[PDB]
């Protein structure tokens, strides 16, 4: 006896650890590559794309 009581109090009083990030810079590494997708690549690309449409109009016509 008294062992269970020891373990009991210690268990109820106790908290176990937690597990934690190695990486929440990945979260951000996105928005940077997302800048890559849009502005950097988007804009120059967008301009080309648009032009072809208008182009196609006249070359249909």
């Amino acid at each position: 006896a008294g062992l269970v009581d020891d373990f009991e109090k210690k268990f109820n009083a106790l908290k176990v650890p937690i597990p934690e990030d190695k990486y929440t810079a990945q979260v951000d590494a996105e928005e940077k590559e997302d800048v890559k997708s849009c502005a950097e690549f988007l804009t120059q690309s967008k301009t080309r794309i648009q032009e072809y449409e208008k182009e196609l109009e006249k070359m249909r016509n």
Partner: protein, 66 residues
């Protein structure tokens, strides 16, 4: 027969006697012990040699991620 309870008396007596003279295997003598000692070890084997008067606690970590 007729004695119902007078028999139970006869049985009863020795139960108290042994308890009020506790020591070894109780009037049994060593013979109970010799079995007991093995049996107690065997049960330890079923749970391994982990102490039962200790409280366990450890930490736990992390691995590769994506």
């Amino acid at each position: 027969l007729d004695p119902v309870q007078k028999l139970f008396v006869d049985k009863i007596r020795e139960y108290r006697t042994k308890r009020q003279t506790s020591g070894g295997p109780v009037d049994a003598g060593p013979e109970y012990q010799q079995d007991l000692d093995r049996e107690l070890f065997k049960l330890k084997q079923m749970y391994g040699k982990a102490d039962m008067n200790t409280f366990p606690n450890f930490t736990f970590e992390d691995p590769k991620f994506e």
